Motif scaffolding. Structure first.
Motif, PDB file in Angstrom:
ATOM      1  N   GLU A   1       0.889  -1.148   0.000  1.00 38.83           N
ATOM      2  CA  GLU A   1       0.000   0.000   0.000  1.00 38.83           C
ATOM      3  C   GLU A   1       0.931   1.203   0.000  1.00 38.83           C
ATOM      4  O   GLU A   1       0.535   2.315   0.342  1.00 38.83           O
TER       5      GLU A   1
ATOM      6  N   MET B   1      -1.184  -6.618  -5.512  1.00 37.85           N
ATOM      7  CA  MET B   1      -2.478  -6.798  -4.863  1.00 37.85           C
ATOM      8  C   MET B   1      -2.551  -5.723  -3.790  1.00 37.85           C
ATOM      9  O   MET B   1      -1.550  -5.449  -3.131  1.00 37.85           O
ATOM     10  N   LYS B   2      -3.722  -5.115  -3.613  1.00 35.08           N
ATOM     11  CA  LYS B   2      -3.864  -4.066  -2.610  1.00 35.08           C
ATOM     12  C   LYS B   2      -5.182  -4.048  -1.841  1.00 35.08           C
ATOM     13  O   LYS B   2      -6.258  -4.232  -2.407  1.00 35.08           O
ATOM     14  N   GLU B   3      -5.069  -3.828  -0.537  1.00 36.25           N
ATOM     15  CA  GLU B   3      -6.211  -3.705   0.364  1.00 36.25           C
ATOM     16  C   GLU B   3      -5.627  -3.437   1.733  1.00 36.25           C
ATOM     17  O   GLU B   3      -5.725  -4.263   2.634  1.00 36.25           O
ATOM     18  N   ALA B   4      -5.009  -2.272   1.877  1.00 37.43           N
ATOM     19  CA  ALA B   4      -4.393  -1.899   3.133  1.00 37.43           C
ATOM     20  C   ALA B   4      -3.415  -3.012   3.548  1.00 37.43           C
ATOM     21  O   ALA B   4      -2.728  -3.577   2.697  1.00 37.43           O
TER      22      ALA B   4
ATOM     23  N   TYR C   1      -4.027  -6.000   4.463  1.00 37.08           N
ATOM     24  CA  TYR C   1      -4.575  -7.341   4.240  1.00 37.08           C
ATOM     25  C   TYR C   1      -4.017  -8.106   3.035  1.00 37.08           C
ATOM     26  O   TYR C   1      -3.960  -9.335   3.046  1.00 37.08           O
TER      27      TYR C   1
END
Ligand SMILES: CC(=O)CC(=O)SCCNC(=O)CCNC(=O)[C@H](O)C(C)(C)COP(=O)(O)OP(=O)(O)OC[C@H]1O[C@@H](n2cnc3c(N)ncnc32)[C@H](O)[C@@H]1OP(=O)(O)O
Ligand SMILES: CC(=O)CC(=O)SCCNC(=O)CCNC(=O)[C@H](O)C(C)(C)COP(=O)(O)OP(=O)(O)OC[C@H]1O[C@@H](n2cnc3c(N)ncnc32)[C@H](O)[C@@H]1OP(=O)(O)O
Lengths: 389, 389
Positions: free
Chosen positions: B78, B106-109, B111
Motif C-alpha cells: 500500500e 495486490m492491494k487492500e491496506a 490485508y
C-alpha cells in the motif's frame, strides 16, 4: 467447467466526436478515424469515478441470489482513488453483497483483469456453489494536447465467474510473459502517464509474439485452431498491427477468418476509446454480440500490460450463450449518450482533475437510476444510489 | 499439501530507540515501551524503496532451480511508487526469474498478502512443478509529530509457496469478513494516511471477532484446538487487546498457551514497528523461530486490512520445519543495525518524502551485498545489485 457466467459494461453519458476533436487539434479527421481507428471518445463527468462506474457495470448482472453466493470481489484498475483502501470494499458495500467475502484490488497497468479472472477460476475449483465478481474500471487520461489524447477513454467492465458458465468456459492453457520495459508508466504524483509511443508499439507486439509462441509450443496449437482472436487494444489501429505480425504465416482461410473476427471484436471500442484494464473484455463483449460464433468454438485472448506483462489464453463458447448476452441493453447504452463539443469536453476534463462538483454541468438529475459520486466530505466520498434501491 | 516452503524478511539498516523518541516527544518512555508495546522503530534510508526491500527479502530464499519454477510473482503493498507499473515486474527482473510468469500487485491496506498466498495455493493445485513468490513490502509513514508516528516501520517479507511445503501447510478453512469503515485510508495525493485511532481499534477487534466466530461455526472448532494464534500487528499492544477479547471464554490452560504464544509471535515486531502487509507474516516468522511448536500442531492466523477486510485461517506445521528456518541470519539482521538519534531520524524522514539521494548519509558503500535504489534518471528508477552477481 468454470468461466464467465455474466458480463456487462458501463461508459459515461457523454462523448466527443473524433472528427471534431481532429478539427480542434488541426489534423486530418481521417488521421483519427483511420490512422488510429477511433470514432467517438468517452468523456467523464465529475460525478462518475471508478467506484461508481464499476458499480454501474455490475448492478445489472447480479441477482439477489448472486449477492449471497459471491465469495470474492476483485477490482482491477490503474486509476485508483485511494492508496490503501481497495475500491472493491466500496463496491461490495454499494452492491449489497454478503459480508463473508474477500475484497481487494489487483494492479499491473491494463493487464490486471486477466489474472483476476484466471485466479478467480482457480479459487472456484473447490467451491461449486460460489461465484466471483471481477470488475475492470479505469479512466485513460493523457491530458489536453498530449500525444495520447486521441486514445483516451473511460468505462468499466463487470464479469461474474462461476461453475456452469452461461457464456464462456475458461481453459487451463494460459501462459504469461514478463519483460521489464519503460514504454508506459506513471510515477506517484503524476496525474498523467509517461509514454514512449514508438517504444510502446514494439513492446506490445513483442509481448504478443513471445506469449503466442510459447503458448503454441506448449499446446501444440496453431492459429488455424481459433475461430477468432480477441486482444487488448489501446486503439484499433494498434491491434491490427499486432494481428498482422502474427498471422503473417497462417493459411489464407485462417487469415480471412481472424481478420474478420478482429473487426467484430473492436466494434464497440471504436466508440469508447481505451479503458485500460477493461479494453480486452469490452472487445470480448463486442465480439460475442457482433459476431455469430458457434458454441464449442474456441477464442484466443491476449491480455497486455505495459511494464510489461502479456498473457495468452483460450476460452470456449458455451451452448446457448447468445441468450445470455445483453446486446439490446449495450447498443442502447452507447446510443443514449450525448455528444459534447471539444470546448465542453475540455471543461469537463479540467474539472475532473480537481474533482469540482457541479450538479448542473454533469446534469445529475438525469442519473436517478445509476450510481454516481455526489460529494466528498472530510476526505470521504459519498455516492448516490439508484432510485430503485 | 501446499504452503509456505520458505520465508524470510528484510528491514533497513537503521532504527531509532523508542525511549529516545518518547523523550523527544515529551512523553513517558513507558507509554511507547509498555503502552503501545514497541522498543525500536525501523528507519528507512533513501536508497531503500519497496522494490529493493522486497528483492532483499527474497534473494536469500531463491535458488537457481526456484528461478526456473516460479510461475507467479505477487507483490502486496500500500506503499506503491507507480500507479500503473506493478513493482512485481522490477523484482522479477532483479531476481532473474524465468520470463514465463505472471507479475502483479495486490492491494487492500495491510490485508493484501493473505489473499496473495491463499490464491497462490489455489493456483498451484493443478501445477505440480511450479512455485509462487509472494512479497509483502511497505513503509508505514504517518508523519513527524503525528498521532501514528510511534507505530511507524518499514520492511518486507518474502514467501515461497509450493507443493510439499517444508514449513507450513495451508489448510482449506479460510473465512473473510468485509465491512465498509473509515478507520484508516489515504486518498490519492496524500503523503500520509488519515486515521481515526479510537475507531481503528474497535474496527480491528470487531473484524477479528466476526471472522473468528464464523470460522469457529463453519469448522466446528474452538480456541482450544490451536497451539497458538498469530495476527496482524500494528503495534504489539493492539494485538494483546484483540486476543483478550476472545480468550475470555477459554479454559485456563488455553489462555496461558495462547497468551504465551502471542509473546513469541510479536518478539521481532517489537524491534521493527508496523510494516503493513508484512506485519502478520513477520509475526509468523517470530513465532516459528522463538517458540518450539511441534510438527502437526495448528496455528490460527488473523489477517486485517483497514477499510476494512479481515480473514481468519489456519496452517499446520510440517515435520522438520525447524531445519528450514533462518533464526541465526534473522537475529543477525536485527542486531547489525545502527541506532540513529531522533534528529537524524527526522532528517532521513524528510529526505524520504522527496527521494533526495545522499550517498554519504545513506552510507551506500556499506550496501555492496544488497539491492538498493541507486538513482532516478528521467523518471526511471535504477537499482544496484549485490556484488556477488
Ligand atoms: C496504453 C496502453 O493501454 C498499453 C498499450 O496497449 S501500449 C500501446 C501504444 N500506446 C498507447 O496507446 C499510448 C498512447 N499512444 C500514443 O502515444 C499516440 O496516440 C500514438 C503514438 C499511438 C499515435 O500518435 P501520433 O504519433 O500523433 O499518430 P502517429 O503515430 O504519428 O500515426 C498516425 C497514424 O495515422 C496515419 N495517418 C496520418 N495521416 C493520415 C490521414 N490523413 N488519413 C489517414 N491515415 C493517416 C499514419 O500513417 C499513422 O498510421 P501508421 O500506424 O500506418 O503509421
Ligand atoms: C494501520 C493498520 O495497519 C491497520 C490496523 O491494524 S488499525 C489498528 C491500530 N491502528 C493504528 O495503528 C493506527 C495508528 N495509531 C494511532 O492512531 C495511535 O498511535 C494510537 C491510537 C494507536 C495510540 O496513540 P496515542 O493516543 O498517542 O496513545 P494513547 O491512545 O494515548 O494510549 C497509549 C497507551 O499507553 C498507555 N500509557 C499511557 N501512558 C503510559 C505510561 N506512562 N506507562 C505505561 N502505559 C502508559 C495508555 O493507557 C494506552 O494504553 P491502553 O489505552 O491500551 O490501555
Amino acid at each position: 467447467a468454470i468461466g464467465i457466467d455474466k458480463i456487462n459494461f458501463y461508459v459515461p453519458k457523454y462523448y466527443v466526436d473524433m472528427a471534431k476533436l481532429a478539427e480542434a487539434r488541426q489534423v486530418d479527421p481521417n488521421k483519427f478515424l483511420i490512422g488510429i481507428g477511433q470514432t467517438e471518445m468517452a468523456v467523464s463527468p465529475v460525478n462518475q469515478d471508478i467506484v461508481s462506474m464499476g458499480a454501474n457495470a455490475a448492478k445489472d448482472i447480479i441477482t439477489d441470489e448472486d449477492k449471497k453466493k459471491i465469495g470474492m470481489v476483485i477490482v482491477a484498475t490503474e486509476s485508483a482513488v485511494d492508496a490503501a483502501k481497495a475500491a472493491a470494499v466500496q463496491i461490495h458495500n454499494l452492491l449489497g453483497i454478503q459480508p463473508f467475502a474477500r475484497c481487494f484490488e489487483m494492479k499491473e497497468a491494463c493487464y490486471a483483469a486477466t489474472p483476476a479472472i484466471q485466479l478467480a477460476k482457480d479459487y472456484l475449483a473447490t467451491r461449486p456453489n460460489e461465484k466471483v465478481l471481477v470488475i475492470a474500471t479505469d479512466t485513460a487520461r493523457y491530458g489536453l494536447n498530449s500525444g495520447g489524447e486521441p486514445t483516451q477513454g473511460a468505462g468499466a467492465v463487470a464479469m461474474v465467474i462461476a461453475h456452469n458458465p452461461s457464456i464462456l468456459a475458461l481453459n487451463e492453457d494460459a501462459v504469461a510473459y514478463t519483460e521489464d520495459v519503460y514504454d508506459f508508466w506513471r510515477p506517484t504524483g503524476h496525474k498523467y502517464p509517461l509514454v514512449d509511443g514508438a517504444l510502446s508499439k514494439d513492446a506490445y507486439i513483442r509481448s504478443f509474439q513471445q506469449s503466442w509462441n510459447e503458448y503454441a509450443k506448449r499446446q501444440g496449437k496453431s492459429l488455424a485452431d481459433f475461430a477468432s482472436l480477441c486482444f487488448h487494444v489501446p486503439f484499433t489501429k494498434m491491434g491490427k498491427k499486432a494481428l498482422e505480425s502474427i498471422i503473417d504465416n497462417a493459411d489464407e482461410t485462417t487469415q480471412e477468418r481472424l481478420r474478420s473476427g478482429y473487426e467484430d471484436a473492436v466494434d464497440y471500442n471504436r466508440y469508447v476509446g481505451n479503458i485500460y484494464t477493461g479494453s480486452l473484455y469490452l472487445s470480448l463483449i463486442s465480439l460475442l454480440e457482433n459476431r455469430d460464433l458457434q458454441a464449442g468454438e474456441t477464442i484466443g485472448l491476449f491480455s497486455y500490460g505495459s511494464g510489461s506483462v502479456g498473457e495468452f489464453y483460450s476460452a470456449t463458447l458455451v451452448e446457448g450463450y447468445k441468450d445470455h448476452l445483453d446486446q439490446a441493453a449495450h447498443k442502447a447504452l452507447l446510443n443514449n449518450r450525448t455528444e459534447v463539443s471539444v470546448d465542453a469536453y475540455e471543461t469537463f476534463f479540467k474539472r475532473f482533475d480537481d474533482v469540482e462538483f457541479d450538479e448542473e454541468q454533469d446534469a445529475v438529475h438525469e442519473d436517478r437510476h445509476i450510481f454516481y459520486l455526489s460529494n466528498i466530505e472530510n476526505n470521504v466520498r459519498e455516492y448516490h444510489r439508484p432510485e430503485l434501491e
